[PDB]
Amino acid sequence: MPFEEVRDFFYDRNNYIHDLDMAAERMFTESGMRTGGLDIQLAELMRDRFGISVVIDDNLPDTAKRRYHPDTKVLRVAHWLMPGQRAFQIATQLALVGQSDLISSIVATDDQLSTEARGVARIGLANYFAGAFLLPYREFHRAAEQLRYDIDLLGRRFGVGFETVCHRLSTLQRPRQRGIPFIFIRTDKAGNISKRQSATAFHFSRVGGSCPLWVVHDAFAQPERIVRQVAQMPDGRSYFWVAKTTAADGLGYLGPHKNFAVGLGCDLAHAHKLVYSTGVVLDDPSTEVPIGAGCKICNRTSCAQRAFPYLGGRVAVDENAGSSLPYS
Amino acid sequence: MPFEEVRDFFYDRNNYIHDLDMAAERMFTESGMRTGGLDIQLAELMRDRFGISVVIDDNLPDTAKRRYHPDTKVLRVAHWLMPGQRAFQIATQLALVGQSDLISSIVATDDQLSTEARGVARIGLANYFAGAFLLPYREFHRAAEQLRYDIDLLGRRFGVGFETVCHRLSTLQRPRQRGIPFIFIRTDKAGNISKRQSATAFHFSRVGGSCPLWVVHDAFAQPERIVRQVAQMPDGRSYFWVAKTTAADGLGYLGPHKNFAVGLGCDLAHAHKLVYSTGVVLDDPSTEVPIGAGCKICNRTSCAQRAFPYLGGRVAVDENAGSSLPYS
Amino acid sequence: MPFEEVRDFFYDRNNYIHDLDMAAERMFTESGMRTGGLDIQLAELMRDRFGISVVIDDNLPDTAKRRYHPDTKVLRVAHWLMPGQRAFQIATQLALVGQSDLISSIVATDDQLSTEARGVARIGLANYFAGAFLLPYREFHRAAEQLRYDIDLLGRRFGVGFETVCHRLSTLQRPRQRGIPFIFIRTDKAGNISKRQSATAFHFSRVGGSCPLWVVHDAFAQPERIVRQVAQMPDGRSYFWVAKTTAADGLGYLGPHKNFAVGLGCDLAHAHKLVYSTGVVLDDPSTEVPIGAGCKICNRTSCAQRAFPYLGGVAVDENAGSSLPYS
Amino acid sequence: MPFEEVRDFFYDRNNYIHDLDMAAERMFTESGMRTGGLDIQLAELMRDRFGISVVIDDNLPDTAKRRYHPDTKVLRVAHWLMPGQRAFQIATQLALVGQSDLISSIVATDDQLSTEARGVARIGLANYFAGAFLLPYREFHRAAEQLRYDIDLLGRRFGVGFETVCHRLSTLQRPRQRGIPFIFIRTDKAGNISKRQSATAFHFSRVGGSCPLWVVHDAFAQPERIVRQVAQMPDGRSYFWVAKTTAADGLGYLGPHKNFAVGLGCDLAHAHKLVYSTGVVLDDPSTEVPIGAGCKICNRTSCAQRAFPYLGGAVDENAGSSLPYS
Ligand SMILES: CC(C)(COP(=O)(O)OP(=O)(O)OC[C@H]1O[C@@H](n2cnc3c(N)ncnc32)[C@H](O)[C@@H]1OP(=O)(O)O)[C@@H](O)C(=O)NCCC(=O)NCCS
Ligand SMILES: CC(C)(COP(=O)(O)OP(=O)(O)OC[C@H]1O[C@@H](n2cnc3c(N)ncnc32)[C@H](O)[C@@H]1OP(=O)(O)O)[C@@H](O)C(=O)NCCC(=O)NCCS
Ligand SMILES: CC(C)(COP(=O)(O)OP(=O)(O)OC[C@H]1O[C@@H](n2cnc3c(N)ncnc32)[C@H](O)[C@@H]1OP(=O)(O)O)[C@@H](O)C(=O)NCCC(=O)NCCS
Ligand SMILES: CC(C)(COP(=O)(O)OP(=O)(O)OC[C@H]1O[C@@H](n2cnc3c(N)ncnc32)[C@H](O)[C@@H]1OP(=O)(O)O)[C@@H](O)C(=O)NCCC(=O)NCCS
Ligand code: SF4
Ligand code: SF4
Ligand code: SF4
Ligand code: SF4
């Protein structure tokens, strides 16, 4: 499974690629970058260092974010992208043409990847490079701690959106300068989890996450507003979750619509460092919400929300009782 | 998998159990039932015909809707249940003590069921009987046509809730007295589909339904309000879907909460008979929403919402292109 | 204005009518009532004590909750009403036919009411009696304290809805057995405040409440779910607000729809007694949301949400762009 | 009451200022502007034609969108603004320094304005100019008709937000090149209507609009999604309404938040021209929603939602109704 192979590639590397990250930051510093208008400077850097001409093309197809023409070294970027997104596109292409060898050797370090998986992993590492270039490690880590992890304020400072900030936060595993260890999740209204990235072993790092009581799936009921939750898994470990929906503009009233929820999760021990714990009492184990990973694999015994019987237990029927607890 | 076995049991019988339904209706008429306050009348019927004392009990555990004591023939019903729900509980018990043999032979018609499945199927048939007794077939079918399938108005007339009405609408397959053929779906915020029932073969009768563009998963974003949609599958068949959330009251601010979405679906050809098509243009194939059964088994080529690649194809990676269409 | 006259009538009486309340409770006790299935028992009491025959009529007009025919003493009640609501209707009629004189003298205690206002006040006092009969003071006050004011659990225990419980909670001003002093508000999506009741002087007891940052107006964004907020008025006083929407069933997809939000508010000092304070930090004056009574009468100086200029002040700056309207 | 004075100022002029609009368009064309990245080009224009240096400032206070320093001719623009918004700020300053006399004479055409109202109206005309420069009349009107008034698609093409597009749509009253006549509304969660603009006389042009059944107040229930409604007033006139909430980003989790709903309304006769009529049956007077201007002045007799009694109209101790103040 190509995308699952790459998910596991990043999971195995603690969602941190030291050489690549360093590389991005080095290039950011050596080439004189300054956060603020990074799109203009990335165009200039492409001109000066790779002979690549960046044009903002309002003639690209409606769905095309960028197209690179290697024969003339011409990078076309969609006019409808915001500066942060233009910067991301340009930095992705920069990874692919100017960091090709580093990415190739990083891919080689996992000899089990399939061919399709290797192509997908190249794209994933280029996206990682773009993130670590738009958000150079040191500056971003300092900003995240100074701002107490306010994702919106971080976006505002670095001119990027919610999802990108959450990506970068889940990558702060540089030895001796680590940020809060995070698990990053992306889902749609139907529960499809299309992105999993985690600094370390979490319950939802690879599978699971279909618990309707979990706040991430409640984001769509509160669109564009940040939701939060103190959650306890069936094994007693407790976690702090923040989430928010993200919507793709334009498209048109009739157009195809993009709707996702992005969630960030960490051990409850770290919650006190988040602006999102403001007003919440964290030391009270009785105010935690009991959630699970998905009913078929959830051993809780008195859940009123349970959707399916637990695959490990007895499905006893009682003809003489009516209960508000399904499959109890 | 017992609950899947029973799902397929009802699916194979076109979600209509002729013997049982008729039994219900007969008993409704022979014993003088009158729509309105069926809970009191069912208590009287239990007493007069089975010697069973129905008492309203506020001492039962919080989660108990009813408890039947066969040794003294005493049926205790939860005080916090509305009259329609009390009637449902009492009539479920009525099925189980007074229709035991009929239920057993109906189960016997499927010699492939496992033991657990046989018990679960008995409970399912008891629920079917309860529904067909609270909503006797002729009266309810006539009401459904008279009210143009307005689920709220049907509930008001028969003193029951949204979910029950939808249950009953999905069973009107009595030969020569058929209602609109429906597929009934129940989901949670996480997309777990816990109920599937269908008059005939529909796409989601047994599997699938994890398409984020399908309006059933959008019910939770518009809580307590009826949502509707003209949906088109990848094979061209068009359907009308109506859905609404249902919440279990009481429980308390800290208590466990029950939240589900219930959807009714039919061929687009039938939509014009629904009050829910009022104001909607049905003859315009361009105003239909293109949905799927779930990205991994969806062959659409330009879905902006796609969460996973379609397993029936391949998408080569293109290092030189950025798209708003995932897995193009 | 007739409805404002009666609003002020109840406001002046601290939203507690001692004689009437006591009356209800006595009647509840002397006639052997038991909380649970009060609708059946109220029908029995109407027959035994007033010769009033209660029929559940599925033939009433669609919008009629009840109609009383004094010539035959026949009380018709809508079949689509839940048992708690039927009980309420029956007890309203009970107030009007069996407590006529008490209500008349209570109204007489306010010589300023207009004639229309006196009629509206009779109906209001009958509703008060119905509330105090379905929810007898002693039992309900004890239950509220035991349940830490969980409105849903009170509704479950007494078989009534959110709005009725909140009504009754805001009336627990009986000397030597007081509940948390509350201000009761009902609004629609457009901000129209159609009900105001308060145990004591609150900011929104009589006027105001059009602040978009106030959580009550956010109830409609989170339908059927309880919303809560620690609010600070411009004068520094802090309050705890809980609110929830209430929707009228039936009616039909095309039918006329009723949607309201009901909010309960009290001084922050009392918040710790509410189940709704669970998980909330109450001692931190910095986590309070700064709201007002309505922009035109709100003196805050750096509100990004401000809708209109404050009437007490108004500078234009051709050389500046601000995210603060009417700085 | 300055803001009500300026509201009436624009209402009296059909929400179209012909001289200023033309000016904007001329300046757009004469200076070689091209739709797309107008913020950079407006910086260039400011420098070349008025000697004003536009700098992107991340040192301004958090609430300052721009500060112009007339003593050194330096316009500082907030870094957290999107390109359309930076362009809007720059064009506002351009109005105020380069169209000062035109704006002054336009204000002078209403000798009844108070002193404060004159300043507020100067700002209003500067904003009008910014809109008419970012969205040049001919080009924008053509785009609106081609795109069937898709507000999002118009925003995408011209690099601006929902509210700005709706603003511009409500001004297309240029003689012989008119767009759909619209009434533009902005409200908050509490029903406060802070903006009213109308091409012609509509019910809510100056007063009213507190009807809970009106779809504009339902936008917050469906945040960030376009809502639509076919509404009929108590006088029989029918209207098509579209609305959507708009939220101000940044600010922070604890920060002060800006939330508004912006609604566009037109006569039902025009609805068939809107993309938003797709899927709606428009000819069925029975599928129209009966709304009002606000209960105290609404004469409907069977509204279940009624909040206050109608001022133009008895208690019945023997009846209980689901229709308040019947
Ligand atoms: C999974 C995938 C197809 C999603 O495609 P998509 O839905 O079109 O969305 P994208 O991921 O391209 O971009 C969406 C947002 O994420 C951000 N983003 C993506 N990867 C990022 C990264 N590594 N660091 C920071 N931000 C990132 C983009 O900036 C964008 O922000 P925007 O919406 O404001 O422009 C795509 O991310 C991909 O191919 N990834 C390769 C790595 C991979 O397979 N990971 C598997 C994890 S389960
Ligand atoms: C699947 C199941 C465990 C769900 O349990 P639950 O979530 O606790 O909910 P219930 O279905 O018992 O009751 C919920 C509502 O559905 C209604 N309902 C349930 N079965 C019904 C039926 N056959 N006909 C009509 N209404 C029905 C109940 O009256 C109730 O209405 P209310 O909430 O307003 O009071 C349970 O329905 C069950 O055991 N069913 C029988 C087995 C079966 O059919 N399996 C096939 C699965 S597709
Ligand atoms: C204001 C008024 C017209 C509202 O009418 P309405 O919108 O038809 O709503 P009602 O008040 O009739 O009933 C709605 C709910 O409030 C409850 N309620 C009303 N008065 C109550 C009281 N005094 N105590 C407890 N509950 C009460 C009812 O039980 C009902 O609960 P339900 O929805 O579960 O059935 C009506 O309450 C009234 O006439 N009041 C008279 C007093 C008055 O004028 N108050 C002015 C306040 S500014
Ligand atoms: C209403 C007002 C006082 C304060 O408004 P505010 O809430 O602080 O915000 P602004 O109106 O300045 O800007 C909000 C949006 O409207 C847009 N906008 C404002 N005036 C506009 C116009 N004339 N044309 C087009 N777009 C306009 C801005 O571009 C901005 O878009 P953005 O959010 O993407 O950046 C101010 O707009 C004003 O000066 N109005 C004068 C005219 C008036 O009084 N009208 C009637 C009001 S009762
Ligand atoms: S059974 Fe477990 S996984 Fe399912 S809803 Fe309950 S807590 Fe969540
Ligand atoms: S790919 Fe298919 S299943 Fe997935 S969102 Fe698109 S239409 Fe729905
Ligand atoms: S100005 Fe006052 S009343 Fe208006 S939104 Fe701000 S705090 Fe609320
Ligand atoms: S009476 Fe009804 S229709 Fe008229 S304004 Fe009030 S809520 Fe709207």
What's the CA gap between C47 and C59, in Å, rounded? 21
Q: Residue with structure tokens 């009782």?
A: A321
Under DSSP, the state recorded for D317 is: T
3-state secondary structure chain A: CHHHHHHHHHHHCCCCCHHHHHHHHHHHHHCCCCCCCHHHHHHHHHHHHHCCEEEEECCCCCCEEEEEECCCCEEEEECCCCHHHHHHHHHHHHHHHHCHHHHHHHHHCCCCCCHHHHHHHHHHHHHHHHHHHHCCHHHHHHHHHHCCCCHHHHHHHHCCCHHHHHHHHCCCCCCCCCCCCCEEEEECCCCCEEEEEECCCCCCCCCCCCCCCCHHHHHHHCCCCCEEEEEECCCCCEEEEEEEEEECCCCCCCCCCCEEEEEEEEEHHHHHHCHHHCCECCCCHHHCEECCCCHHHCCCCCCCCCCCCCCCCCCCCCCCEEECCCCC
Q: What are the C-alpha distances in Å from C262 to residues C166, C265, D7, D189? A: 8, 10, 34, 15
What is d(CA D246, CA B310) in angstroms, rounded to the nearest whole number? Answer: 35
Which region holds residue D43: left if phi is over 0, alpha if psi is between -120 and 50, else beta? alpha
Number of H helices, E strands in chain B: 9, 10
Phi, psi of B232, deg, nearest 5: -120, 130
Running DSSP on this structure, what letter comes out for residue C209?
-
Question: Which of C164, C227, C253 has the most B C-beta neighbours within 10 Å, making it the best mutation to test the interface with B?
Answer: C253
First to last CA, chain C: 36
- CA B59 – CA B36 distance, rounded (Å): 27
Bridging pattern class, strands D64-69 and D53-57: unpaired
Interface residue of D152, D215, D222, D281 to substitute, partner B, most B CBs within 10 Å: D281
Residue among C103, C174, C163 nearest C139 (CA): C174
For tokens 């308060």, what's the residue? Answer: C198
* Contacts (Cβ under 8 Å, ≥6 apart) of B144: B154, B169, B172, B179
Tokens of B296: 């991994």
Residues A306 and A326 sit within 8 Å (Cβ to Cβ): yes
Distance CA A219, CA A204 (A): 17
- Evaluate: CB of C215 within 6 angstroms of ligand 7: no
The answer to whether C137 and C21 have CB atoms below 8 angstroms apart is: yes
Long-range contacts of A108-116 (CB under 8 A, 24+ apart): A110/A9, A110/A12, A112/A5, A113/A5, A113/A6, A113/A9, A114/A2, A114/A5, A116/A2, A116/B314, A116/B317
- Nearest of C225, C220, C228, C202 to residue C293 by alpha carbon: C202
Q: CA B133 to CA B30: how far, in whole Å?
A: 12
Residue with CA at minimum distance from ligand 2 atom 43:
B124
C residues 205..234 contacting D (CB < 8 A): 209-212, 214, 217-218, 220-221, 223
Compute CA distances A37 → B315, D55, D58, whole Å: 34, 12, 11
Query: D149: distance to nearest CA of chain A, Å?
Result: 10
> Which candidate, C6, C25, C27, places its Cα nearest to that of C15?
C6
Backbone angles phi, psi at D197, to 5 degrees: -145, 135
Instruction: Report the interhelical angle of A162-169 vs A115-134 (nearest 10°).
Output: 100
Q: Are A213 and A288 in contact (CB under 8 A)?
A: no
Which ligand is nearest the CA of D210, by number?
Answer: 8
Contact residues for A36 (Cβ-Cβ < 8 A; gap 6+):
A159, D56, D58, D79
Record the tokens describing residue C195, joined without a space.
């009900």
Q: How many residues does chain B have?
A: 328
Beta-bridge partner residues of A228? A242
Distance from C-alpha of C53 to C-alpha of C51, rounded to nearest angstrom: 6
DSSP C61-109: -TTEEEEEETTTTEEEEETTS-HHHHHHHHHHHHHHHHSHHHHHHHHHT
Residue B238 tokens, joined: 């068009």
How far is the first Cα of chain B from the last one, in angstroms, to the nearest whole number?
36
* DSSP 3-state of D184: strand
Give the Cα separation of B87 and B85 in Å (integer). 5
Nearest residue, CB atoms, D80 vs list A156, A226, A252: A156
List CB contacts of D227: < 8 A, sequence separation 6 or more.
D215, D218, D219, D242, D243, D244
Half-sphere exposure of B251 (CA within 13 A, CB side): 17
Alpha-carbon span C317 to C323, nearest angstrom: 13
CB contact under 8 Å between A63 and B308, yes or no, is no
Strands of the D289-290 sheet, one edge to the other? D193-198, D183-187, D259-267, D238-247, D227-232, D289-290
Residues contacting residue C74 through CB under 8 Å, at least 6 positions apart: C52, C53, C55, C68
Tokens for B207, please give them.
């599997």
Chains in contact with A, where contact requires at least 3 CB pairs less than 8 Å apart: B, C, D
Ligand 3 atom 19, closest CA = C127
Q: Are B82 and C80 an interchain contact pair (Cβ–Cβ within 8 Å)?
A: no
| Closest among D296, D293, D322 to D307, alpha carbons compared | D296
Measured from the Cβ of residue A89, the count of other Cβ atoms closer than 10 Å reads 24
Closest CB to C280: pick one of A222, A230, A279.
A279
Is the CB of residue C140 below 6 angstroms from any atom belonging to ligand 3? no
User: Which chain A residue is nearest to residue B288, measuring alpha carbons?
Assistant: A254
User: D260: how many CB neighbours lie within 10 A of its CB?
Assistant: 22
Ligand located closest to D289 CA: 8
Q: Report the residue of B54, B189, B288, B328 to disrupt the A interface, i.e. the one with the largest count of A CBs within 10 Å.
A: B189
Q: Which of D64, A328, A214 is nearest to B257 (CA)?
A: A214
* Pocket residues: Cβ below 6 A from ligand 1: A 3, 6-7, 85, 88, 120, 123-124, 127-128, 131, 161, 163-164, 167-168, 194-196; B 326
CB B68 within 8 A of CB B74: yes
User: B71 alpha carbon to ligand 1 midpoint, in Å?
Assistant: 64
B153 CB neighbours in chain C (<8 A) are: 250-252, 255
User: Minimal CA–CA distance to A123: which of A100, A144, A142?
Assistant: A100
Whether chain B has a CB inside 8 Å of the CB on C55: the answer is no
| DSSP category for residue C246 | E
- Tell me the pairing of strands A74-78 and A53-57: parallel
Q: Are strands A259-267 and B74-78 parallel, antiparallel or unpaired?
A: unpaired
Chain A partners within 8 Å of D271 (Cβ): none
Scanning the structure block, which residue is given the tokens 């195995």?
A12
C-alpha to C-alpha distance for A47 and A36, rounded to whole angstroms: 19
Distances (CA, A) of B267 to B187, B200, C78, C262: 20, 11, 37, 41
Do B324 and A63 count as a contact with CB atoms less than 8 A apart? yes
Ligand 2 within 6 A of CB of B232: no
Separation of CA C231 and ligand 7 centre (Å)? 12
For residue D251, which phi and psi values (nearest 5 degrees)?
65, -45
* In the block, residue with structure tokens 């112009």: D68
Q: Are C300 and C327 in contact (CB under 8 A)?
A: no
* Strand ranges of the sheet holding C74-78, from the earlier edge strand across to the other edge: C53-57, C74-78, C64-69, D319-321
Nearest to A271 by CA among A168, A148, A139: A148
Distance of CA B282 to the CA centre of its chain: 25
Q: Which residues, at least 6 apart from A30, have a Cβ–Cβ distance to it below 8 Å?
A: none
List the residue whose alpha carbon is closest to atom 8 of ligand 4. C325
B95: Cβ contacts below 8 Å, ≥ 6 apart: B103, B125, B126, B127, B129, B130, B133
Give the H or E element holding residue C129.
Answer: helix C115-134
What is the rounded distance in angstroms from the CA atom of residue D324 to the CA atom of residue C105?
26
Method: X-ray
Which ligand does the CA of C203 lie closest to? Answer: 7
**Does the beta carbon of C36 lie under 8 angstroms from any beta carbon of chain D?**
no
Q: Distance between CA atoms of C42 and C54, rounded to whole angstroms?
A: 9
Q: Do C192 and D295 touch (CB under 8 A)?
A: yes
Nearest to C190 by CA among B38, D221, A239, A56: D221
Query: Which residues 165-194 of chain C have a CB within 8 Å of chain D?
Result: 188-194
Nearest to A54 by CA among A71, A36, A38, A67: A67
The residue whose CA is least distant from atom 4 of ligand 6 is B295
Residue in D closest to B283 by C-alpha: D279
**d(C-alpha B291, C-alpha B216), whole Å:** 11
**Dihedral over Cα of D194, D198, D204, D205: its sign:** positive
B252 in reach of chain A (CB within 8 A) = no
A229 to chain C: closest CA residue? C279
Contact (CB<8Å) C152/B250: yes
Contacts of residue D256, defined as CB under 8 A and 6 or more positions apart, other chains included, come to C302, C303, C304, C305
Q: Is C292 exposed, middle or buried (0-12, 13-18, 19+ CB in 10 A)?
A: buried
Mutate to test the interface with A, among B116, B192, B251 (most CBs of A within 10 A): B192
Q: How far is the CA of B260 from the centre of ligand 2 (A)?
A: 12
Residues from chain A that touch B217, judged by Cβ atoms under 8 A, are 189-191
- The per-type count for chain D, helices as H runs and strands as E runs, is 9, 10
User: What is the phi-psi region of residue D193: left when phi exceeds 0, alpha when psi lies from -120 to 50, beta otherwise?
Assistant: beta
Per DSSP, D280 falls in state B
Angle of the C115-134 helix axis to the C2-12 helix axis, nearest 10: 50
Query: Bridge partners of A245?
Result: A261
* Selection from C309, C186, C201, C323 nearest residue C258 by Cα: C186
Residue B162 to chain C, least CA–CA distance (Å):
10
Task: DSSP letter for C51, please.
Answer: -
Kindly give the number of the ligand 3 atom that is closest to the alpha carbon of C85.
35
Instruction: Indicate yes or no: CB of C287 within 8 angstroms of CB of A279.
Output: yes
Q: Compute, in angstroms, the gap from residue D306 CA to the centroid of ligand 8.
A: 5
Instruction: Give the domains, in start order, of chain D with CATH numbers.
Output: 1-134 (1.10.10)
Residue that is written with structure tokens 């529904």 in the block: B131
